[PDB]
Amino acid sequence: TIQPGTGYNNGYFYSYWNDGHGGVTYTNGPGGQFSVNWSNSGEFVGGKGWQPGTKNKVINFSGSYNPNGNSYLSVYGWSRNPLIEYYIVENFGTYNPSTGATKLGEVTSDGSVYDIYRTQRVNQPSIIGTATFYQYWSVRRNHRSSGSVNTANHFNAWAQQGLTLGTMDYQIVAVNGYFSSGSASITVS
Ligand SMILES: O[C@@H]1[C@@H](O)[C@H](O[C@@H]2CO[C@@H](O[C@@H]3CO[C@@H](O)[C@H](O)[C@H]3O)[C@H](O)[C@H]2O)OC[C@H]1O
Numbered sequence: 001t002i003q004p005g006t007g008y009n010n011g012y013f014y015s016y017w018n019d020g021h022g023g024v025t026y027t028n029g030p031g032g033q034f035s036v037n038w039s040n041s042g043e044f045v046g047g048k049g050w051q052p053g054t055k056n057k058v059i060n061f062s063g064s065y066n067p068n069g070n071s072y073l074s075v076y077g078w079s080r081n082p083l084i085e086y087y088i089v090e091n092f093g094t095y096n097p098s099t100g101a102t103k104l105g106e107v108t109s110d111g112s113v114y115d116i117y118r119t120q121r122v123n124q125p126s127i128i129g130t131a132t133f134y135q136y137w138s139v140r141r142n143h144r145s146s147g148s149v150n151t152a153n154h155f156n157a158w159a160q161q162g163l164t165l166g167t168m169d170y171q172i173v174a175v176n177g178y179f180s181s182g183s184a185s186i187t188v189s
Pocket residue numbers: 015017043044045085121124125126127128129176
């Protein structure tokens with residue numbers, strides 16, 4: 001079980017963050033693999049990928065994702081200047097994170113339509129500390145736990161719609177959870 005933070009494991013960047021509540025076990029495995037097992041967690045997000053990400057990376061993932069409650073499986077990352085937290089959501093649990101959010105378009109990529117949304121976080125944790133930032137979402141209609149994500153299709157569609165990204169910070173395949181339980185085992189490349 002790993003200490004919250006960032007680093008490198010078996011050639012891949014990882015980031016694992018939680019809110020301190022307890023109930024999450026994040027582990028790094030061989031190559032691009034990571035696992036998450038959680039039981040009555042707080043808020044958390046962790047996984048493997050790259051630091052920094054790029055605006056045209058093709059990201060592959062495969063494995064198992066078994067949430068019980070509020071959780072997502074995504075390509076997850078940040079930009080700076082502007083500060084943006086973004087999600088290309090491939091699967092989720094009890095909650096579609098776009099519920100009640102303003103829909104900003106659609107994009108077709110990697111075998112599914114995705115619906116695009118923007119939300120905002122005010123005075124919240126971020127890669128630079130407490131800050132205000134928009135969140136950009138592409139939410140896959142056809143849920144899956146394996147596939148490839150052509151990130152450029154999302155970032156280009158977001159830009160077309162007026163959702164600008166700054167300089168890329170980290171970019172991972174991640175499990176997000178919010179006060180839920182589950183298990184997952186995911187391999188990135
Ligand atoms: O020590 C600092 C780290 O703790 C910090 O890590 C980031 C803190 O914000 C995290 O983003 C939240 C993740 O969960 C989502 O549900 C929320 O919307 C976000 O607010 C992010 O994942 C962490 O990387 O980085 C800076 C360090 O100085």
